[PDB]
Amino acid sequence: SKFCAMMDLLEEMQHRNRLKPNEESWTWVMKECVKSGQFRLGYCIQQVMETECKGCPADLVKANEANAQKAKTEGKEHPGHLSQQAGLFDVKVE
Amino acid sequence: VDHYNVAQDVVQMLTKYRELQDIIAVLGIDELSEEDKLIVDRARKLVKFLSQPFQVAEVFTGMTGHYVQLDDTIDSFSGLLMGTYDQVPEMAFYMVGGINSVLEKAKKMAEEAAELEKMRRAR
Amino acid sequence: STKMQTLHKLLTGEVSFKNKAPVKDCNIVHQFGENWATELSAYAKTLPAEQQKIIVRQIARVKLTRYTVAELAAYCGDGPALLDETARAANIEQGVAFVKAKGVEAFEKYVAEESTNANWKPEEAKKFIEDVKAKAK
Amino acid sequence: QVQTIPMIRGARFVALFNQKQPSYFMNAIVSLYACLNGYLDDVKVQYVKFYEYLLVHRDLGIMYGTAKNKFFYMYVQELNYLIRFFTLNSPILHGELEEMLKQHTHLFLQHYQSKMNAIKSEKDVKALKNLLYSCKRAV
Amino acid sequence: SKQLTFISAGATAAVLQSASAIVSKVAGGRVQTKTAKEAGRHAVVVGPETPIGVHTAVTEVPKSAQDPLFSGVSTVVVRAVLPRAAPDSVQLRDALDVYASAGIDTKEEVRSATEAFKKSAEVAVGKAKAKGVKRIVLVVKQASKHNCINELFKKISTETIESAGLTTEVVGTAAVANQLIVNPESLGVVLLNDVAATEQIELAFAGVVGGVSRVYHTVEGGKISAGHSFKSVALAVAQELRELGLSSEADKVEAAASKNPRAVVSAL
Amino acid sequence: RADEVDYTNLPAPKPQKTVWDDNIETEVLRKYLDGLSQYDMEEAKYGV
Amino acid sequence: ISGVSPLLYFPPTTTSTTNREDQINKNTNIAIQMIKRYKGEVPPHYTRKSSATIEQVEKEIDALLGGAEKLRKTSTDDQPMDKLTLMERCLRHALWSYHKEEGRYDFDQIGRWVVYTPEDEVKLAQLKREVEAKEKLAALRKRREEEGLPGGPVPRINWPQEYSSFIDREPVVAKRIRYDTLASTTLERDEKQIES
Amino acid sequence: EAAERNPTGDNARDRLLKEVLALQARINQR
């Protein structure tokens, strides 16, 4: 995962080398979320940039929303198996 | 998984049986609740059911031995734990092999006692 | 010696595989080798006439077993000796239909993929692709 | 037997510590936070493992059509590195974390624990035990 | 005057045209050749697909047309055929298994299937008794989908056969097919449950042997010939002409089929 | 000169359950697709 | 896959022309046949005692409940209800049950005037997903048809890997035939007849 | 109400268990 690799690098920069990430650092994270299609992660990064940085790039936010809608139209908003209902004695615990 | 579950259940029931044996030694058998009484009865059957006749001892002890397959062992003990065999007499499990032996020995006990009644009723 | 004896028993049906799997040509090639037929034929010559005839008959039947049931039903209707030519003609006809359907370059790529997954030789694939192209015109 | 708040949470924590295989960081920390904040107070001790399994693997909010969060779902395994950077008690991840925990607890108490408390049949009792054993061995 | 009924079930026009030419040239016009979709007697069915009105699908290894590879083999493959409805309608072999899953009542369908299996079993045991074999081999596809039709097939076939006094050995589709193609002398009588795979196996055996004509027993009572290739159809026509009471013509067709399989019409 | 190989041993064909893309068409057809996967595995194990 | 195959594999499109309309028509006929067998018979015809339209009934209910708005007083859920509240609940429950049966799946009001049991909420939730699921599938299948992709589902498979894995081609060839045949069919029915 | 409207080795054990207990009831009777 590129997102996991980048987030770990930021953690090293922040919590161990004591260097604050800049706006450019978070833009790369947001770009990867848009490129990968992980729209739910993009939401969190958008809030992160707004809270810490001076907002989020508008294009990335709009692109992230576009990805979410296409998933919504295509029915991919959530993993399939999670919506399948199960009972007390029908949950196949593994 | 079934084998492990049955083994743990037997161990748990035996441990509870020891604890109940301590209470009846002070409070009394009548002081046990309904669940405790059932646990005691099942545990006693398990203790009696763990004894097996070895084929090596046929000459000395006379009784024919038994070789209990693992599949039978799990089913036989699993059924007893649930409570399916709650009507079989306790002594039918003593020195018998497999669930089928428990049943045939029950026939031979029920039919044996049938003659005793016709005798004691009469005479 | 043991390999030939085991192969003879297996073809005769005396001894089956460990899992009772069907005795097909493909499985035999997997275990004994690619050229099991040649070595078995040479070995059979050291056996009486009756065993030699059985070996030849079993080998021929195993070769017929190299096709699927559906292919045998569709193509082997008019005898086994004519099965190979009928299957080849049917296979060639399918190639012509594909060529007329989705061009040639894609067909060339498809033939390459099918030959790769068909365990075919490059010469056979080139011979096949040339024949279908010639048949088209 | 007086059971104060520390006693209840302590008992749940001991139940949660029972593990067989290593647990992913996000799953472990989320469960600990939920227990620490009292979300497992109504959950019986013997059902803690089943509650944890549903929280980690399954998702009752998506199941019973009552989802409101945007990103904080336990199926998003990439949140592990956001929970490790901002801390669960962050303005960014704290709001959604509480919502899903509350929904998960409410659904579990409404649907699963209620049925588990109404089992008397011997066959059902055996089935419930098998389920608990499986849950204890898998998260 | 007399009539031969040609049924077409998934057969290419070339085979039908060849059959028409063969009968016209051999018969000489004494017996007309009409085309239809169902018949009970004096009928030849061309094509792999099963026609409408046939309950048994027996096939043997005729001595005259034995291929040199399969010389001396003697095994009878009987396929049980359930009643066939219109192509659009759901077939019984599929309805009997899907309606149970859907919960729909399956009483009439079970009764119809039971009658078909009983008739097929009676034919199979009769062949086994005539040949003298003591045990027959039932063939059932072991797919989870066909978990109901096969179960009824086994329940009824074994019941009838055991009532007759012979033994039954149940087997799947792949193992029997490989055995029948590789070592067929170890099977005397093999019954096949009604499935598409079994139909393909029956066709494969009928073709590998060298090309033969399959016999279909219909509800009305009788035998109709069935072919799928040039040689098989020619043999089917030869048998049909023999049934009508033509020996010399039947022999000529059989000889032509043996010599020139794909061009019998020109050969004779 | 010890044992060489058991020629009558065949490695069983390791089946693989077909996986369908997670789309709405899959959710609507979840049961039907699962049945096809089970049938495919049964065919692979038995052979046909 | 040890052992050279006898022949290559080709797309089994023997039925090059298979109109989508015919397949959907056959699916509809089979669906109708099964529904008739499952349901059995269309229920006996019933003659209305009075003539009135659903819209007229709804308007009458609105008029009846509108005059008592000032008198109507809200109260806690656990407190006893009033005559106006009971009448409104009964009327709205009947109206929305009829609407949901008809097909006007307005869940916002159904969840309010029909949900009184956890089983009721379960059924509504199951229904709500099903309707949305069908709508998305219909839209996706229409867009897919416009693009030109095969109507039927296609599994995520790499047959070059499958060929190498399996030893014998027969199961692999059979599998390819089934999926290719499946991908060349349209699994749809005529919902006008079904609704009728 | 709707529910009412709608509707071998182990067999040997059930047979024996039932029959075993059959005589146990009979002896009590007479």
Following DSSP, what letter does each residue of F3-43 receive, concatenated? Answer: ----TT--------------SHHHHHTHHHHHHHHHHHHHH
Distance (Å) from the C-alpha of residue E11 to the closest C-alpha of chain G? 14
Whether the CB-CB separation of F30 and G167 falls below 8 Å is answered with no
A 6-25 → D contacts, CB under 8 A: 7-8, 10-11, 14-15
Rg (C-alpha) for chain F, rounded Å, is 18
Nearest to F43 among E143, E175, E177 (CB): E143
Using an 8 Å CB-CB cutoff, list chain G residues near D106: none
Full DSSP string of E148-207: SHHHHHHHHHHHHHHHHT-EEEEE-SHHHHHHHHH-GGG-SEEEE-S-HHHHHHHHHHHH
How far is it, in rounded angstroms, from Cα E257 to Cα E234? Answer: 6
* Token duo for residue E204: 């494969």
Place of tokens 């192209």: C133
Measure the CA angle with vertex G55, ends G54 and G61; round to 5°: 90
Resolution in Å, one decimal, please: 4.3
| Burial (CB count <10 Å: 0-12, 13-18, 19+), residue E217 | buried
Q: What are phi and psi of C57, to 5 degrees?
A: -65, -45
What does DSSP assign to residue E12?
A: -
Determine contact, residues B6/B77, Cβ cutoff 8 Å: yes
Check: CB of residue C111 under 8 Å from CB of residue C129: yes
Q: Do chains B and E touch (3 or more CB pairs under 8 A)?
A: no
Q: Can you list the pairs that E109-118 forms with residues at least 24 positions away whose Cβ atoms lie under 8 Å?
A: E110/E152, E112/E82, E112/E83, E113/E82, E113/E149, E113/E152, E114/E152, E114/E156, E116/E55, E116/E80, E116/E81, E116/E82, E116/E83, E116/E194, E117/E80, E117/E152, E117/E153, E117/E156, E117/E157, E117/E160, E118/E156, E118/E160
DSSP B90-119: GGGGTT--HHHHHHHHHHHHHHHHHHHHHH
H abuts D (3+ Cβ pairs < 8 Å): no
Contact check, Cβ <8 Å, H17/B103: yes
3-class SS of residue C32: coil
Counting other chains too, the contacts that E244-249 makes at CB distance below 8 Å and 24 or more residues apart are E244/E2, E244/E4, E244/E31, E244/E42, E246/E27, E249/E26, E249/E27
Instruction: Count Cβ atoms below 10 Å from residue E41 Cβ, excluding itself.
Output: 14
CA distance E134 to E29: 46
Q: How far out from the chain centre does Cα C119 lie?
A: 11
Per the CB < 8 A criterion, the answer to whether E250 and E241 are in contact is yes
Question: Please, is D138 exposed, middle or buried when counting C-beta atoms within 10 Å of its C-beta (0-12, 13-18, 19+)?
Answer: middle
Q: Which residue from D29, D30, D32, D38 is spatially nearest to D5, judged by alpha carbons?
A: D38
Contacts of G178 (CB under 8 A, 6+ apart): F36
E112 neighbors E83 (Cβ within 8 angstroms): yes
Instruction: Answer yes or no: do F27 and A74 touch at CB < 8 A.
Output: no
Write down how long chain F is: 48
Pairing status of strand E54-59 against strand E214-218: antiparallel
Q: Are C60 and E69 in contact (CB under 8 A)?
A: yes
CA-CA distance, B22 to B42, in Å (whole number)? 17
| F42 touches E at CB < 8 Å | yes
Residue E189's φ and ψ, nearest 5 degrees, are -135, 125
Tell me the chain H residues in contact with residue B114 when contact means C-beta distances shorter than 8 Å. Answer: 23, 26-27
Q: What is the 3-state secondary structure (H, E, C) of chain G?
A: CCCCCCCCCCCCCCCCCCCHHHHHHHHHHHHHHHHHHHHCCCCCCCCCCCCCCHHHHHHHHHHHHHCCCCCCCCCCCCCCCCHHHHHHHHHHHHHHHHHHHHCCCCHHHHHHHCCCCHHHHHHHHHHHHHHHHHHHHHHHHHHHHHHCCCCCCCCCCCHHHHHHHCCCHHHHHHHHHHHHHHHCCCCCCCHHHHHC
Consult the annotation and say whether D3 binds a ligand. Answer: no
CA G92 – CA A61 distance, rounded (Å): 43
Residue C80 Rama label (left phi>0; alpha psi -120 to 50; beta) = alpha
d(CA C117, CA C119): 6
Identify which of F47, E198, E178 has the alpha carbon closest to the alpha carbon of residue G168. Answer: F47
Closest-CA residue of G relative to A85 is G126
E76-80 and E54-59: which strand pairing?
A: antiparallel
Number of other CB atoms surrounding residue B30 within 10 Å: 7
Give CA–CA dist E123/D49, Å, rounded. 62
Report d(CA G11, CA G14) in Å as an integer: 8
Rounded to 5 degrees, what angle do the CA atoms C19, C24, C29 make? 95
Q: Where are the alpha helices (DSSP H) in chain E?
A: 13-27, 92-102, 107-131, 149-164, 174-182, 196-208, 230-244, 247-259, 264-267
Indicate the helix (H) or strand (E) that contains E33. Answer: strand E31-36
Question: Cβ contacts of residue E140 below 8 Å, gap of 6+?
Answer: E146, E150, E153, E154, E170, E171, E172, E173, E193
Contact check, Cβ <8 Å, F48/E177: yes
Residues of H in contact with B106 (CB under 8 A): 20, 24
Beta-carbon count within 10 A of G122 CB: 15
Q: What angle do CA E167, E148, E77 make, to 5 degrees?
A: 45
Q: Does C94 touch chain G (CB under 8 A)?
A: yes
Residues in Cβ contact with E62 at an 8 Å cutoff, skipping those fewer than 6 apart = E212, E213, E235
Chain F residues whose beta carbon lies within 8 Å of the beta carbon of residue E175:
47
Q: How far apart are CA E75 and CA E81, in angstroms?
A: 19
User: Which residue is associated with the tokens 């017929």?
Assistant: C64
Exposure string for A46-77, b = 16+ CB within 10 A, e = fewer: bbbbeeebeebbeebbebbeebbeeeeebbbb
> Helix (H, G, I), strand (E, B), or coil: what is residue D44?
coil
Residue D136: both structure tokens together: 């204890």
Does D have 3 or more CB contacts under 8 Å with G? yes
Two structure tokens written together for D96: 């959604």
Residues 101-130 of D with CB under 8 A from B: 122-123, 126, 129-130
Distance from CA of residue A7 to its chain's centroid?
Answer: 11
Let me know the angle formed at the C-alpha of E41 by E40 and E47, rounded to the nearest 5 degrees: 75
| E145 closest CB neighbour out of F39, F46, F48 | F39
The number of beta carbons lying within 10 Å of the beta carbon of residue C18 is: 12
